[PDB]
Amino acid sequence: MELSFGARAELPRIHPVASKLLRLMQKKETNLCLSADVSLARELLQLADALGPSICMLKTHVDILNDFTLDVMKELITLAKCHEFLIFEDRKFADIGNTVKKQYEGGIFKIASWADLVNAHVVPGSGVVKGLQEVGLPLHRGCLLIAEMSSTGSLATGDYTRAAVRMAEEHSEFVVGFISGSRVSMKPEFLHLTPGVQLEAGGDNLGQQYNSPQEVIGKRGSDIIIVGRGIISAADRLEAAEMYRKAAWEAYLSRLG
Amino acid sequence: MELSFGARAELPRIHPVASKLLRLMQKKETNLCLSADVSLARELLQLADALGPSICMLKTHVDILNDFTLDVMKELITLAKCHEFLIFEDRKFADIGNTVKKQYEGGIFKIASWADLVNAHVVPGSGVVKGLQEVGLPLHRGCLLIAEMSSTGSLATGDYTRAAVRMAEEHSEFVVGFISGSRVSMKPEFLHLTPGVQLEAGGDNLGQQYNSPQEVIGKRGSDIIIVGRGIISAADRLEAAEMYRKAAWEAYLSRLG
Ligand SMILES: O=c1ccn([C@@H]2O[C@H](COP(=O)(O)O)[C@@H](O)[C@H]2O)c(=O)[nH]1
Numbered sequence: 251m252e253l254s255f256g257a258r259a260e261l262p263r264i265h266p267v268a269s270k271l272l273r274l275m276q277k278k279e280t281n282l283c284l285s286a287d288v289s290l291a292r293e294l295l296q297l298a299d300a301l302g303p304s305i306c307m308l309k310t311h312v313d314i315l316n317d318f319t320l321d322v323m324k325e326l327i328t329l330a331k332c333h334e335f336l337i338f339e340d341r342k343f344a345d346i347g348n349t350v351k352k353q354y355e356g357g358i359f360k361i362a363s364w365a366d367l368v369n370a371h372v373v374p375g376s377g378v379v380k381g382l383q384e385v386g387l388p389l390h391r392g393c394l395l396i397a398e399m400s401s402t403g404s405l406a407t408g409d410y411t412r413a414a415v416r417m418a419e420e421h422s423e424f425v426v427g428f429i430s431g432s433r434v435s436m437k438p439e440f441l442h443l444t445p446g447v448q449l450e451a452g453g454d455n456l457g458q459q460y461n462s463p464q465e466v467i468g469k470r471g472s473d474i475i476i477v478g479r480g481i482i483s484a485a486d487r488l489e490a491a492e493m494y495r496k497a498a499w500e501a502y503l504s505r506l507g
Numbered sequence: 508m509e510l511s512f513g514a515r516a517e518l519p520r521i522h523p524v525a526s527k528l529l530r531l532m533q534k535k536e537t538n539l540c541l542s543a544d545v546s547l548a549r550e551l552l553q554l555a556d557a558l559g560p561s562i563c564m565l566k567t568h569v570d571i572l573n574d575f576t577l578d579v580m581k582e583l584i585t586l587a588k589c590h591e592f593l594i595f596e597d598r599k600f601a602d603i604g605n606t607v608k609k610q611y612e613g614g615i616f617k618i619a620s621w622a623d624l625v626n627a628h629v630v631p632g633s634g635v636v637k638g639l640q641e642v643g644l645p646l647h648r649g650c651l652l653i654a655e656m657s658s659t660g661s662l663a664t665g666d667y668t669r670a671a672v673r674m675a676e677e678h679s680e681f682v683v684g685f686i687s688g689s690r691v692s693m694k695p696e697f698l699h700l701t702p703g704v705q706l707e708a709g710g711d712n713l714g715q716q717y718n719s720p721q722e723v724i725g726k727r728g729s730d731i732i733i734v735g736r737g738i739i740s741a742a743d744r745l746e747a748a749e750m751y752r753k754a755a756w757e758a759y760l761s762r763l764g
């Protein structure tokens with residue numbers, strides 16, 4: 251009894267951010283998250299505008315932008331609202347609770363002010379989530395927990411992955427899903443987002459490993475693919491995004507029956 | 508056959524950054540790292556100047572400064588050189604190698620340009636270290652691997668800690684030690700730095716747990732204590748730093764015999 255994205259958006263325990271995401275995924279027929287791994291604000295914004303209709307989400311690493319300002323993020327929000335996608339800052343909070351609350355709200359990035367979603371590693375224990383909650387719940391935000399990683403030698407396996415699932419399921423007022431390589435929770439309220447995705451087999455020279463959209467959405471049961479270089483390094487990023495969108499969407503439909 | 512800090516500084520396999528640190532620890536009779544967990548540049552710099560003579564290291568979270576600029580970090584370097592301490596940015600890199608190299612070199616913080624030391628979580632596998640190396644080795648920097656954490660529910664235990672030790676010992680041209688609660692490596696070339704330290708028993712409301720300097724240096728065999736609020740929240744931060752310095756230094760001497 252797998253439910254569609256649109257039906258999952260109505261589940262009793264769904265988080266509002268998850269519901270908004272699932273609705274726009276269904277409406278736009280996209281389960282693609284662009285990993286906008288660029289150093290120039292203009293390139294980030296030009297990609298967001300052109301690829302916005304093709305994506306459910308844009309994932310940032312703002313600490314790599316050479317020309318970050320809060321006004322860049324205001325412009326990104328305008329595009330996210332226009333084209334209907336969520337903004338996910340891939341910050342990987344991974345400190346004690348008291349520290350991560352300050353890293354989320356403050357400093358020069360003010361992440362909580364513009365990011366719909368952030369993520370956290372579970373290695374510190376649940377205080378990492380408690381600390382982020384304290385900022386994120388008043389700001390109506392959501393969080394993803396890193397249950398698995400795509401890179402060679404990842405230690406996010408076995409009991410570590412199980413601990414991430416338990417932590418998410420016990421902080422469901424803020425945690426909306428996972429970064430994972432596969433479905434890790436049996437609860438349909440949670441979102442599974444999978445990086446390490448390309449159409450062709452391979453990897454990079456620093457431990458990244460790729461699997462295809464069909465493999466990770468269809469056979470591994472994930473919801474959303476996160477794609478960086480497979481799009482970003484292509485000449486025509488729009489065409490590349492459409493290839494990935496169609497691959498991930500069909501894989502989802504074919505598992506739904 | 509425990510060696511003094513000064514003798515460890517001469518070990519055949521010692522990393523130059525570790526040697527510099529061990530020498531100044533011995534010279535100044537300090538194994539205290541100040542965790543300068545403040546939001547104002549002026550407070551950071553005033554603490555660095557006043558407490559510089561008492562510390563071997565100043566640990567930053569630059570992403571919490573409200574008024575970060577690269578010129579603040581130039582001023583911090585002047586103080587580090589004057590008073591002889593290393594600068595450790597507690598960034599907790601925790602992404603795939605290709606991403607962390609950009610996060611270390613680039614963006615608005617340009618961490619590698621001013622931080623003697625950074626740290627990394629081992630959860631992504633060794634590509635996290637490979638990626639950071641690529642920036643840090645040309646810049647003559649060092650790295651600490653997070654082998655244990657002080658917070659309640661930490662998953663950095665057992666085989667995870669052992670994996671961190673193996674990863675460090677296989678990347679010894681860049682990795683100089685650990686964030687840990689105790690001695691985790693038997694190789695004296697590696698430094699052990701321990702947060703979660705206060706003179707009194709207790710914790711915080713977000714999962715931090717404290718142990719005393721005597722416990723973590725004397726009984727658990729660590730080298731350096733990392734102290735934030737036990738100093739920062741005190742009225743007289745200089746007196747507080749001296750209390751912690753004397754505690755950690757005596758605990759070291761008494762284990763040395
Ligand atoms: O397990 C993980 C978690 C996160 N990312 C992130 O997802 C993107 C993958 O990019 P690419 O390999 O598709 O270019 C990068 O931003 C990277 O930091 C991974 O690749 N793997």
Ligand SMILES: O=c1ccn([C@@H]2O[C@H](COP(=O)(O)O)[C@@H](O)[C@H]2O)c(=O)[nH]1
Pocket residue numbers: 345346349542544568597655656657658686702703704715733734735736737
């Ligand atoms: O396992 C760890 C790793 C790092 N820190 C860091 O060390 C400092 C501890 O501060 P305090 O509890 O002494 O104020 C903080 O900056 C925190 O982010 C910990 O407390 N525990």
